[PDB]
Amino acid sequence: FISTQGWDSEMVVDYRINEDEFHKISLLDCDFFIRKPPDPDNDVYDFREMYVTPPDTDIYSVPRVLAPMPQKYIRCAMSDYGCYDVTEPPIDAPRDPLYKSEREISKVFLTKHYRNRRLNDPEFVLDFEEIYVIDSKTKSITRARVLVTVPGGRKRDRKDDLLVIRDNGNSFKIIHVGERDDPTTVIEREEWTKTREDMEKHLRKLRDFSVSNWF
Amino acid sequence: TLQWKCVESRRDSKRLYYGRFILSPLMKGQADTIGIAMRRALLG
Amino acid sequence: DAGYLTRRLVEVVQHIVVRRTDCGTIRGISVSPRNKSRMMSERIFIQTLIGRVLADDIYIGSRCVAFRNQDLGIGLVNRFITFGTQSISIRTPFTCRSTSWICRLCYGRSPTHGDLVELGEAVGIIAGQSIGEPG
Amino acid sequence: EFWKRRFLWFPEEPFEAFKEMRERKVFDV
Amino acid sequence: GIQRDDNGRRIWRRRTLTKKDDMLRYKLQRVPFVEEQVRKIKEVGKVMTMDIERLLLSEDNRFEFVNSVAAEATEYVEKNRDEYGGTKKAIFHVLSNRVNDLGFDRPEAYAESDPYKPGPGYLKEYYT
Amino acid sequence: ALDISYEMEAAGRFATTFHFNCLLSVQATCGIPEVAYATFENMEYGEDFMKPDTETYNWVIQAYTRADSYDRVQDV
Amino acid sequence: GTGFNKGDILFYHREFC
Amino acid sequence: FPLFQLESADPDFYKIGYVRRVRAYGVEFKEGPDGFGIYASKDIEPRRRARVIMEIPHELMITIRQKHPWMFFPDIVPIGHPIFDIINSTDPERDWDLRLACLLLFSFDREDHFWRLYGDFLPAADECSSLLLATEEDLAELQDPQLVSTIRQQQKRVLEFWEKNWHSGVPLKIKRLAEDAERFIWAVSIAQTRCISMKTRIGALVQDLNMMIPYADMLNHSFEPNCFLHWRPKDRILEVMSNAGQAIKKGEEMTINYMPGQKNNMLMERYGFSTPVNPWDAIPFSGDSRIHLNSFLSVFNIFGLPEEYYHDSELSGDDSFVDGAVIAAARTLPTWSDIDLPPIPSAERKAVKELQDECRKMLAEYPTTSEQDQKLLDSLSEARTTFATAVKYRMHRKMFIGKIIKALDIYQERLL
Amino acid sequence: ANLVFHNKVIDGTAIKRLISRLIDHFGMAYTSHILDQVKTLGFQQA
Amino acid sequence: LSLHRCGLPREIAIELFQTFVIRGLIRQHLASNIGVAKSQIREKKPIVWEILQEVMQGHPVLLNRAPTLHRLGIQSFQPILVEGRTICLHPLVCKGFNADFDGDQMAVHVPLSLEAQAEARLLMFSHMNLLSPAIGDPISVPTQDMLIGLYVLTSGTRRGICANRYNPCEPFFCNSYDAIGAYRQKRINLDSPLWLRWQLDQRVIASKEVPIEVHYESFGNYHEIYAHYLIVRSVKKETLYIYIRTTVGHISFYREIEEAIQGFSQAC
Amino acid sequence: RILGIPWGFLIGAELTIVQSRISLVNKIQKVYRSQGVQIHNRHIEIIVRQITSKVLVSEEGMSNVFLPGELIGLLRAERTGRALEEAICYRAVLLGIT
Ligand SMILES: Nc1ncnc2c1ncn2[C@@H]1O[C@H](CSCC[C@H](N)C(=O)O)[C@@H](O)[C@H]1O
Ligand SMILES: [Mg+2]
Ligand SMILES: [Zn+2]
Secondary structure, three states, X not given: OOOOOOOOOOOEOOOOOOHHHEEEEEOOOOEEEEEOOOOOOOOEEEEEEEEEEOOOOOOOEOOEEOOOOOOOOEEEXXXXXXXXEEEOXXXXXXXXXXXXXXXXXXXXXXXEEHHHOOOOOOOOOEEEEEEEEEEOOOXXXXXXXXXXXXXXXXXXXXXXXXXXXXXXXXXXXXXXXXXXXXXXXXXXXXXXHHHHHHHHHHHOOOOOHHHOOOO | OOEEEEEXXXXXXXXXXXXXXXXXXXXXXXXXXXXXXXXXXXXX | OHHHHHHHHHHHOOOOOEEEOOOOOOOOEEEOOOEOOEOOOHHHHHHOOOOOEEOOOEEEOOEEEXXXXXXXXXXXXXXXXXXXXXXXXXXXXXXXXXXXOEEHHHHOEOOOOOOEOOOOOOHHHHHHHHHHXXX | OHXXXXXXXXXXXXXXXXXXXXXXXXXOO | OOOEOOOOOEOOOOOOOOOOOHHHHHHOOOOOOOHHHHHHHHHHXXXXXXXXXXXXXXXXXXXXXXXXXXXXXXXXXXXXXOOOOOOOOHHHHHHHHHHHOOOOOOOHHHOOOOOOOOOOOOOOOOOO | OHHHHHHHHHOOXXXXXXXXXXXXXXXXXXXXXXXXXXXXXXXXXOOHHHOXXXXXXXXXXXXXXXXXXXXXXXXX | XXXXXXXXXXXXXXXXX | OOOOOOEEOOHHHHHHHHOOOOEEOOEEEEEOOOOEEEEEOOOEOOOOOOEEEEEEEHHHOEEEEOOOOOOEEOOOOOOOXXXXXXXXXXXXXXXXXXXHHHHHHHHHOOOOOOHHHHHHHOOOOOOOOOHHHOOHHHHHOOOOHHHHHHHHHHHHHHHHHHHHHOOOOOOHHHHOOOOOHHHHHHHHHHHHHHEEEEXXXXXXXXXXXXXXXXXXXXXXXXXXXXXXXXEXXXXXXXXXEEOOOOOEOOOOEXXXXXXXXXXXXXXXXXXXXXXXXXXOOOOOOOOOOOEEHHHHHHXXXXXXXXXXXXXXOOOOOXXXXXXXXXXXXXXXXXXXXXXXXXXXXXXXXXXXXXHHHXXXXXXXXXXXXXXXXXXXXXXXXXXXXXXXXXXXXXXXXXXXXXXXXXXXXXXXXXXX | OOOOEOOOOOXXXXXXXXXXXXXXXXXXXXXXXXXXXXXXXXXXXX | OOOOEEXXXXXXXXXXXXXXXXXXXXXXXXXXXXXXXXHXXXXXXXXXXXXXXXXXXXXXXXXXXXXXXXXHHEEEEEEEEOXXXXXXXXXXXXXXXXXXXXXXXXXXXXXXXXXXXXXXXXXXXXXXXXXXXXXXXXXXXXXXXXXXXHHHHOOOOOOHHHOOOOOOXXXXXXXXHHHHHHHXXXXXXXXXXXXXXXXXXXXEOOOOOOXXXXXXXXXXXXXXXXXXXXXXXXXXXXXXXXXXXXXXXXXXXXXXHHHHHHHHHHOO | OOOOOOOOHXXXXXXXXXXXXXXXXXXXXXXXXXXXXXXXXXXXXXXXXHHOOEEEEOOOOOOOOOOOOOEEEHHHHHHHHHHOOOOOOEEEEOOOOO
């Protein structure tokens, strides 16, 4: 219907949209709306018209866009990004819960299907070079800076690549599936780096630190 | 005379069986040694 | 010295027993979170208010969020802190209409039993022992 | 009524103290 | 909502959950290795502690509860003096009866013995 | 009267100001103000239907002003 | 605590039959 | 030797409660064509005191203060929600059901609320027996203009409230609560048919509440019930207690008294049903012909004061005739009493003949009879729940009049 | 039992706070048995 | 000992319960009169102890240390017969009595009337006095040796430079019982890291942080790697697998508390 | 001097006692909190209430109801203030726990 492309970044529109034709993407700080063309899979997205609202509110506003957006309908797969908030709420009434776990979603990744193939397609693979990032804190949407290391360039076998996301959803890198790292290796790398820096900070205050070795 | 008997048995499921066994009369210190050896044998 | 102090502490309040459900008082000690002379520490604002019985209704806008003669839970206190509730009126031992006994509402929740204090409880001796014990 | 009209840390000033008691709900008309 | 399928039988819609509750799968699971723990709890008499706590959930005043239990035990002893003081205690009988009056089955007066006593004269030596 | 009032409250009907005034009508002439004052304290710090009225205050004052010994001016 | 608040007709008259 | 020798409810119905500290003892939930009900899964032996049947935790209820101001326990409505503004504009005296309907819709829209799951076992619009869902055809079979007028006024009030508060400009969080009018009408019907009012103490606060209580609204109504509701304040639990010393056999339905001292018309107005053994039903007699109250009570063994008439059930032995209908007759028949003055039988014959004439005139005033109404119910195959409810209501009134006639006959027979 | 899964450490402050929350949630009869079991576990690992 | 029990020497118990032992002797016709029963008690006959052990069941006693500073300085316990001449005391009630085992002594009292026994059983037992009246804090909290044991049990893996000598450029268990069994068979240590398959909701206390690294596959499945757990999700399915990185110690602590709760529930 | 009939004695005693109770609890709690001792405010308020519950009949207030220097309760003094005008003159007194 309407074309929000090129409009203001944080202005509030003067009408209430119909959410039956939109993709409602709910994050921690906002609910994100992207126009949904009809489809049995409901995986088709139209990025020309987008809106951002505070969570559970019908005061619509055009979101801030930090990168060029698609013009033709593209089929995409949605995956959220965030943390868990396992708290111990105070026990007020009888049988009050001992803990409370919630999923604080801060980023939503929209990854294009390769050639807009369907999930039921036996040749379905994901196109990791086409990822759009939705940020709750900034109420914005961007395109991911994807770095490709697997040989092949533009033309390759999409079945053998693996995407790695680091740095709070900012680093996107494509590697071969063979060189995937163990979760233990990732955790140990982070622990080793942090503890190495902490130990060097602790030992720096000794007056023979300049004539000492690490081992 | 020294005798043994099963004093309890159950089958909660097909992969969970329980049993309780007795051994008496015993002299002082024998029961602990028998229990330790039997537990090691049962577990490994 | 503490043994002498404990005996005098128990002595002065040995006769205080919870003997009524409600003395019928309307007075209430006012508790304020915001004071322009010091930024109040929320930790002190909580532990003192827990277990107290409100002497007056609390309103947020046109909605009543806490009623008179209602035990102050920790959820209500945080709600009071979350919004701008500058006045809280509570029923304390200072507000009871007697110096020979106290009622259930002016005392508050039981120190050990979780619920409101029960009739016939010798809260005076417990008060005297609680202060003199760590001496 | 005359005393009610005249009635209108607790500060050392007597009328400031009266106003404080009115605000702290210690005493009122 | 009324509909008969031509044979006198009335066909009606069954009510179903038709929704997902994640608390069902995660909560209806049983620990398998508490046989000795349950047996020891029964042997030492913590079920009576649970019963005492349960009885006080319906009492406004606990002192009144204690007085009523003592009065009922006194009536028990006065009516049948010879039945109490040994393996049966009057207060335990009162507590078991008050628990049983709620429909919860309990052994009478929480009276239990050791089936493994090696004949008369042998006394269990407690291991401190 | 006291036995019947105890039985009435045991049966589930609590005493109101009427029954308490009836009881005070006899306690006020016993020569001991403490009995009537105990009844008055029971009434004053109780429920709404037990609260004293003019007749209750009159009974307690009459009990105190016609005491056998000691001074009761402060109490009145 | 626990001390608070002070803690024959129809006989000899049956049917003769 | 062992070798030689109504349907059960959906297990998830009790399982969702059970995982949330709901406990049912000695009873099982069974579902039939009429609706859900609670029945003793075994023989509930009579004990000295009342027995615990069910335990419903407070946190699974939807309760609102019965008196102004409106505070909800537990507090599910957030501060600043427009649903509070919708609730707060209601009439404090008569609009109690509207507030409960608003709370029900709000809870149904709440993702973590329990009633989002329990709401799938409530009767639907085509299964609820409330008269707010009845059309003009069903109300025409009540054969009572007053009840029809009351139902029409209630429907008008509900629709007016919905139109006033659910117009075009309402926010989306409010419009989705009730997109169309019949959704709110069904919410109000559920509130009216399942609300329980009680005086509950929470902590130190004692107050009256209008409560939507799961697993306790499934109990059915009776004027001689075997169960009652008791609130346990210390742990905030509502207990369903069977009467002390009253034996209950396997398969016997567990019932409570929804409201004592209410005739069939009020039951139809509120819960959308009526019973033939209502001991408070009234039949307007002329009052010129009167019988002896004491003899009528003694013949049928009805004892107690006028507000506690009860059949002894011992001297009768096997007389199924004496039931709540006879008690209602004794409470409604024109009677005279002169302490110990005996009645002359001759005057009693004339009085009962005149009263029977009045009863037969009343039966003739109805276009149809009760037996033909039962036949219509048996042959009924394509009618709404309210249709059969109205048919049963008029049939029960006819049965009550016939019971009065038979009681007068046997009373005049046994007077000698 | 909807117990949270502690995965960092149990010190003196944590065990005192955990017991207080268990009393509020489960009551003193349940927590009394939990204390007996935790007492053995702490002794058995020391 | 249980939290509601104490141990009494034979001499103290036979002195305190002497009249009840006399009643037990006479009641079952083993003593002709009071004098004969007392003579039997003086002779330490072997049947005196059976009657004493029988009559001590269900009859509470009151213990008391000397400087009674608060009301928890006297508590009620269920006495049992222990060998020796010392009073056996539970370790978790020592803080309330302010008692340590370097020479302290206690006095024992026997409630006689039914009212006193009811008061002792229903008001003074330790399992109903877990909170201190002063501020409401727990009084029966594990201390010292138990606290050290719990601290060592729940002290997790060595991490970072304390785990590997060089910069890195663990078993998987289906259920906690498998991990504990492997620990019993000396396959793993108390603090060696392991991955535990989790089939409940996310209930592990951890820092509220985004995944360290997300391994997204072109087929749709992606692995989210956190500091203490791994979560496998897919876009085609609604499946969600959780693996917790922990030790045998955390598993043991959680299982201890869970089994205590479940066993107490099942025993009732 | 500002207020005459009992509003002089009543309000003066009320203001003195309200200020005394606040500072009495603060000083006691400050001493214990400096030592790490945790005591609820209720226990101290039970003790202070007995400290600040009496008034002293002034040396010039003489009648047949009270005598000068007599130690009477605060609530009794205020109730007789509204009911009599017979020189009910009193001032708040702080009593030690002994
Ligand atoms: N004794 C009775 N006879 C017929 N209907 C009854 C009844 N008692 C209650 N009801 C009906 O049951 C409703 C109360 S909710 C009770 C359970 C309901 N039948 C269900 O299946 O969900 C009321 O609307 C009323 O119409
Ligand atoms: Mg020592
Ligand atoms: Zn009070």
